[PDB]
Amino acid sequence: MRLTQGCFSFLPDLTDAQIEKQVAYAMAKGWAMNVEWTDDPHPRNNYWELWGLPLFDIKDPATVMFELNEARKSCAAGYIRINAFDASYGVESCVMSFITNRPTNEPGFYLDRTDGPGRQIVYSIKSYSVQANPEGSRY
Amino acid sequence: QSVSERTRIKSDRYESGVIPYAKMGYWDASYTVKDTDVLALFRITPQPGVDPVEAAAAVAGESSTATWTVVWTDLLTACERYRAKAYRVDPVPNSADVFFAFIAYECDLFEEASLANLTASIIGNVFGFKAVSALRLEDMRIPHSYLXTFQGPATGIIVERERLNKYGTPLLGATVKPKLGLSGKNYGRVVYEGLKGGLDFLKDDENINSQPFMRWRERFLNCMEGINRASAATGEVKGSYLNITAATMEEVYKRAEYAKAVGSIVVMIDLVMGYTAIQSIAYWARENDMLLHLHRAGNSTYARQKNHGINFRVICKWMRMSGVDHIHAGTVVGKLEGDPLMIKGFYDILRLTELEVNLPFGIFFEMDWASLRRCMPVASGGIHCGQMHQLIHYLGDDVVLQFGGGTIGHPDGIQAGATANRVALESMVLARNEGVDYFDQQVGPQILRDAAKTCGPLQTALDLWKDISFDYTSTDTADFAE
Amino acid sequence: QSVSERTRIKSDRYESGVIPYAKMGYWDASYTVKDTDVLALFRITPQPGVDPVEAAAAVAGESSTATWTVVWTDLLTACERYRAKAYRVDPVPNSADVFFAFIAYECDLFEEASLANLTASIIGNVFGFKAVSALRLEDMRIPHSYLXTFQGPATGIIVERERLNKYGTPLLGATVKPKLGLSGKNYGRVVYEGLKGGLDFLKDDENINSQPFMRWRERFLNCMEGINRASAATGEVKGSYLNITAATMEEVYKRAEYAKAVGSIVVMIDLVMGYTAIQSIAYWARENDMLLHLHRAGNSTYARQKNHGINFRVICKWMRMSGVDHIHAGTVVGKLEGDPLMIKGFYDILRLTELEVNLPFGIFFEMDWASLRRCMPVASGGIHCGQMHQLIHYLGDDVVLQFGGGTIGHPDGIQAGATANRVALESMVLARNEGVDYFDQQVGPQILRDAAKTCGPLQTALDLWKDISFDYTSTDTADFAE
Amino acid sequence: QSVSERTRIKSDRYESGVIPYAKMGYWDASYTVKDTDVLALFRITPQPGVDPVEAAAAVAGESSTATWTVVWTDLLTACERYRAKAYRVDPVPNSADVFFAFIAYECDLFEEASLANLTASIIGNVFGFKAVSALRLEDMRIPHSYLXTFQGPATGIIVERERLNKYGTPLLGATVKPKLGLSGKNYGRVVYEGLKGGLDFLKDDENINSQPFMRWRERFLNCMEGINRASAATGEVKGS
Amino acid sequence: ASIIGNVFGFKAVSALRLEDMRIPHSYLXTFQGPATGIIVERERLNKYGTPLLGATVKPKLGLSGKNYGRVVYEGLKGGLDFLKDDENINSQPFMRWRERFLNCMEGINRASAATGEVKGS
Amino acid sequence: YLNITAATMEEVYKRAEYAKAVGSIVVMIDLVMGYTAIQSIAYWARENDMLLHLHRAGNSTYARQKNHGINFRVICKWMRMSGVDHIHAGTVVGKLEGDPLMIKGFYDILRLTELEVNLPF
């Protein structure tokens, strides 16, 4: 399956040209980019691995693509995403997040069901990739 | 002769008898507003022959300390401090008999943390007053000191997106249809499909509570199965606004506790439950890590007309104070009343950290929001993916676009309905960010047609509802154009 | 070609696309109303070019099962049964563009015992609809089967009089003034005096909740001292409506439990608390042997104008269902909007065991009340003992006449204010029973002057407010005169 | 070579290392106080050779958002907003080594209706700072918007006087003595005596709670007999 | 109440400092003493032989619960046994307490999954 | 069908709550527990997502004879009102009294949305 986290995962995978234009948008709005890797595609995996610090002082879009490219050359098979962070009062949060890289084959998830009281079900979403292998060799 | 006669008050102000409200301490053009005052803007239509300043002195009087005749018990209190002062009366543009009345109320007149107490003073009686043929509450300046007594949103826009892990587009949703009739099992079917096909949320309809055709527990359990199935199938956080609206506060809580027990990320409530049930469930939502969706049922009974009632922008402020996370605030281009610039003003009220006088949007007062969280506006009601360019233009980024008929009415099924909406949404935003002039009548629809060549569900949708608009003369209009 | 295309519904009704609501099953002139249906009368103003039957089919549709486009999920339900049917459209007299729409809703669409659920369907969205420029809910026929799910009044008129031991006149009362500012100790002073001088009740003002100048416990304790002192001084049951209106249901209950603990015969709540807090506290009142006074704060925001909102007569029905014991329902001759025959219709709704079509009073439907108890109407707002002949004429026997300014504004003190009102009341009723033509402009005022020769407080009052009337053009008027 | 090194922050404010508090945003003499700010006045005695304005800036930093070294995580917040601001440093009369320092704290720094949180920020750490040999909190300006979150007195002077039915003189009282040793029954004796003879209140000594010589319930029951006895002897509201 | 109650404000004394106290065995036996204590703490942690390790999260104030959970995960994953809230981080407009707690727990358990150590904040 | 029938409503509730706690889809009750307990536990079943099976124990003491008692059809109505999900209503061909037309009457009372005069049933 296609992991549909990120905000452009219903379009086809973004070319580098398209990525740069979203990075450009983000930066013209004054926002700070970073790059993150995981190979635990769980919906509740909040903290993907930081590819260095966020690029706070950076003015040129090309610098962020250069880092995305270096993440791609150095990270193991998995997901990478770019996020735009807005440190303005009353935001102080991420405001854009899209997937820049995904594995060729994502097996996805199954729904694990434990009987609670009465008819209630204790659900757990389980990852095929993550249960089979540890971090760094799941795809 | 008797003690009563000898001790009668003989002063001008406190002899017994009626005197006009403008002589009673309720009018002062020279009055300097304090940072701590509560301010109201009233649109007053005096009865013929009633003095416009006397109409505003009356409203001010009867919304604070006054009654119809003079009372000596005023002198047992610090009466000069507790009186409201009407402090400015402007004519409405194009009315020789409708006026804008600004009235300042002292901070200490209001119970801390209490919408009910605020509204008792402010809307309690003055709208039934015979001296006035019409009265609309247009705006309020809730001072920073009163705001800090309120929670504000339980969750808020920032934390909401953090819980969903969803940033950069608007959020998506749909109302389940038909409105009523569906069994709990079939409700879960619609929710699964809607979420699997791409929607972030679905919702129970506002009138779906607990009924002979479907009792609420069946809905909740079958919907959680649908929700988790959709989340497992996509790797996204998913949810459906479980309606916990009930007759009693005891039944609401019961439904809300059950929703939490089974892992629902969100619940919904209807505005008809009323302010005190709303403040309680908004505290309950902060304390139980729940998103609180407010459907605005009954709002347009007092909010639709220009001449009388409460403007919706005021309800937005009061609902953000109380602490709901979502509130429906219009579409512009859908089936429900929504003048473009009024809606923008509403959205600004719900989403900004402070407000600046902006008369075209109906923002009559400047107002700090005291770091109360931001309320997510919801755009529901007769909208389709065909109008995505318009929605993105008028509504911005932080908003839930909801597509009931525009998902479930799709011929190829509900999944296809959903997928069409999301491709539309995503392709459009991608193009906004690229710098394209998307709100152009030529350009926007072509962005959706381009996206539609690799998405057959979206070409189906564009062709099915191409013709559909709801162009009718709006009644809740602005007084200052453009 | 694909499974989606091959299984598309091709029928007229269920092909995808918009069709007018009148073709969707929401119009049927030949429809026979069942005893169990819920009926609504809507005053509809269509937008220009909108077909009046299509406007009523839409309201019916959108208040029951329909949305803007066609949904296949209708076929998973017994859709023919759950649709509302608009079944009659009449023009309004003197409007070539405003119409009366009667719509029948199936009993099973409604959650048992739930005002919130009823109002979600009935007022939820249809008032924001762009297709309609204006919409007033005018009457409802709550069927006997739905009524039996509700408690109705906690106490009711019969038992209320039994608890007071007070029969044969109207009951008497007063709002404490000024509205705000007074300390708890001084509140108890006003209550003692008002009751000692003759009033049955006083009340907290609607905006008296808990504030910096007086917190609610101080009021409650000092008032019970006042109440019992007055009861011991006269040998009558006495009380004061302790306002338990608060921000949260938890705080309301806290105040209501405290009121009970200290022996208050009665509590009050404001309508701004909203329907779900109201249903809960009305159950709580039956279970704790308490009179429940409903002040109607905020009502005139949706109720004042002829063109749009909810008629107050509908609120009366809904509030009697929920179970409040008193509700303010107008004066006619006071300072607040009150057309004579509309007010009589309201009073009939609150006080009768069934209702008969009576178009001059705004009673559009015949309606059994299912032996739900009778709600006591309250007449408050700018009335004085000078108008006793009028009040007795327009309002009848079972009613609380309240005199805030008309008690406390009395120069010789509050006792004298009270005593004047009661002598006025009693002398007038005595004369009604004797067969005198008391409502005559000559006769009535002379009955009060005759009584005033042995009562100096009443001669003072008659002479102080002789001049006072509130004659202004009423906006909530009837469509059928006399 | 590495992503860590290529993405190291290179600005004057957020490069790693130690810079004076006065240059981190915690000193600003031109700052205009908002009515919503919490303000504090400190009598700062800086260590010999420490700059007065630097010590005031340190107190502002370490009672708001600072630590001894620069942190990139400042840039995940609206860090300019949350920083307290020493906005005034003045000399103290008849001293050249002690200074008055006025600091300003954004309203949003403090949990609503919590003395514990206010005093965690304002007094928590800064009194034990080596850079300053002494420090005294002299006064604070608790803004209107913070106060409306707090209850203030349960009863107050006004309502207390109403409950007692005494107005026009100061109220009267006495601590029961000896401080420790008395049984509950004798405690109530003393309470009866002093209330009957004219006192409005008596009181338990601060260190009278519950001990082998007297357990708290015996004191309370015996006192209520004394109180009510005095009240019936006098026609007055009384207490202990 | 007895020992520091009044005496430090007495006029006859210009200054007064309580330097030490001898709490007698008999009084001490009425008290619980540490809830867990050094010995049992190390046992629950499975860490004996070196001083334990921690860090206060920074900046003191302003961080959202999300970012707090980030700092906690990073620090714990890099070798720390603990992180902590700052003394003045309770619950504030910028970050309400439930958000911090939930986000830190994710961070903590992620750290322990990555290291095979008991972790906390 | 885990039988929660007991002497006291306090014991019925322990046993109902236990059954829910351990995951049972259904509980049973006996008609000998009587109407007030039944209506109470029928409200309980709704509240607790439980099937409620009603064994009709003792019914035949008043339902067997034509001349005197209460026809079981009335009991079906009363028990359908109270809110039991199952009730025993007859076999025709088994070991307990059951004329075919009376049984079909009972089954229609239990299962139809409306009834129409049908004298033979």
Ligand SMILES: O=C(O)[C@@](O)(COP(=O)(O)O)[C@H](O)[C@H](O)COP(=O)(O)O
């Ligand atoms: O009841 C309905 O019609 C809706 O479900 C929309 O359904 P569709 O998506 O099928 O139109 C919403 O409740 C209204 O939009 C509420 O109006 P508002 O958002 O203005 O409060």
Ligand SMILES: O=C(O)[C@@](O)(COP(=O)(O)O)[C@H](O)[C@H](O)COP(=O)(O)O
């Ligand atoms: O606030 C007031 O003005 C009153 O206290 C009347 O005081 P007076 O007796 O001094 O006029 C009542 O709350 C209103 O009558 C309510 O209106 P209604 O009864 O129409 O709801």
Ligand SMILES: [Mg+2]
């Ligand atoms: Mg709806």
Ligand SMILES: [Mg+2]
């Ligand atoms: Mg009032």
Ligand SMILES: [Mg+2]
């Ligand atoms: Mg002492």
Ligand SMILES: [Mg+2]
């Ligand atoms: Mg610290």
